[PDB]
Amino acid sequence: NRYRLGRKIGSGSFGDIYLGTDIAAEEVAIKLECVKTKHPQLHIESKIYKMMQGGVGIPTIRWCGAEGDYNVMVMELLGPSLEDLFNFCSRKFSLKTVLLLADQMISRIEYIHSKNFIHRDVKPDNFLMGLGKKGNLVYIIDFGLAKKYRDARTHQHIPYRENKNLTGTARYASINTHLGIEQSRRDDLESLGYVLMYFNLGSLPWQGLKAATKRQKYERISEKKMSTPIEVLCKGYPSEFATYLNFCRSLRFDDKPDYSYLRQLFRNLFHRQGFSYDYVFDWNMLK
Ligand SMILES: COc1ccc(OC)c(CCC(=O)Nc2cc(-c3sc(/N=N/c4ccccc4)nc3-c3ccc(F)cc3)ccn2)c1
Numbered sequence: 001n002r003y004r005l006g007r008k009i010g011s012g013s014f015g016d017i018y019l020g021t022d023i024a025a026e027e028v029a030i031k032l033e034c035v036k037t038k039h040p041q042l043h044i045e046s047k048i049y050k051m052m053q054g055g056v057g058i059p060t061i062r063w064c065g066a067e068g069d070y071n072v073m074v075m076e077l078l079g080p081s082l083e084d085l086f087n088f089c090s091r092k093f094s095l096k097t098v099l100l101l102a103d104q105m106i107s108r109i110e111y112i113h114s115k116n117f118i119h120r121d122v123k124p125d126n127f128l129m130g131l132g133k134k135g136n137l138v139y140i141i142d143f144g145l146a147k148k149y150r151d152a153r154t155h156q157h158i159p160y161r162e163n164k165n166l167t168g169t170a171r172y173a174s175i176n177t178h179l180g181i182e183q184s185r186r187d188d189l190e191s192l193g194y195v196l197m198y199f200n201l202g203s204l205p206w207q208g209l210k211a212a213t214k215r216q217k218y219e220r221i222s223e224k225k226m227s228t229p230i231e232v233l234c235k236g237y238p239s240e241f242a243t244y245l246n247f248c249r250s251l252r253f254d255d256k257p258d259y260s261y262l263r264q265l266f267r268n269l270f271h272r273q274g275f276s277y278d279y280v281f282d283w284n285m286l287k
Helices: 042-052 082-088 095-114 185-201 214-227 239-249 259-272
Strands: 003-011 016-022 027-034 061-067 070-076 127-129 138-140
Touching: 003 027, 042 061, 042 070, 082 127, 095 127, 095 138, 095 185, 095 259, 185 239, 239 259
Parallel strands: none
Antiparallel strands: 003 016, 016 027, 027 070, 061 070, 127 138
């Protein structure tokens, strides 16, 4: 109930992230926002976490408020991110681990969409494993770029818009995001498709391109994504990864994705491969 701030561990969408301690009991994670910021957002994000509360893989917020020069949000401590675990696993995941992760990540995105929001920054850093009895559970974090895509009462979808600035991480952004189109449900899922192929490959082919300014930088990434057919991107990997991406790329702006179809693709592959659904990930094998 009273919190000690520890080392800074990084930065979220709109603030810095810290390890901390609840001195009376337990270790926590703490996000800070300057209270004098011109674009306050931490309390908005807190309310989204609250709307999401109780979902599988949705982190619990312990306290939000103001102290000194900061707005403060305290979260239950979670385990390593999927990017951290990727590094710990020598930047290679077995097919079994990719498929286990795919099943849960699709479900996390579906859940957020069911609560009327799109995430808009699907990337490995925003998925964290739980701890203790939740160690086999993938959590999704960070609603700082999240947006409501439909009305809570009528479910009327937001309108189509063009010439929008790229929101999120360029590496995993959808093609339509690069082309300036308003993001919708389909784009969260397309980004996940790039995340899965990133886990398969160790890098994506639009990493490390040269340019002068950040504007051109994103342009080069856009051009490489558009000019790399899915069959080339996914060459040498099971067809399901291409099928997944083609499905996502083919969705209409306001389509409700068939999340079950996408999970079934990978589940059927998992079964054909003879894998056991025992939640044993590559990092559980580290000695
Ligand atoms: C017990 O021994 C340990 C040993 C080493 C450790 O690590 C060095 C740890 C710490 C594990 C940990 O990170 N746990 C954690 C993190 C968060 C995050 S992570 C994030 N952004 N990450 C990125 C990454 C890349 C790019 C952008 C952002 N934001 C929030 C967050 C969000 C809201 C909030 F209120 C508080 C925190 C939430 C809960 N647990 C432990």
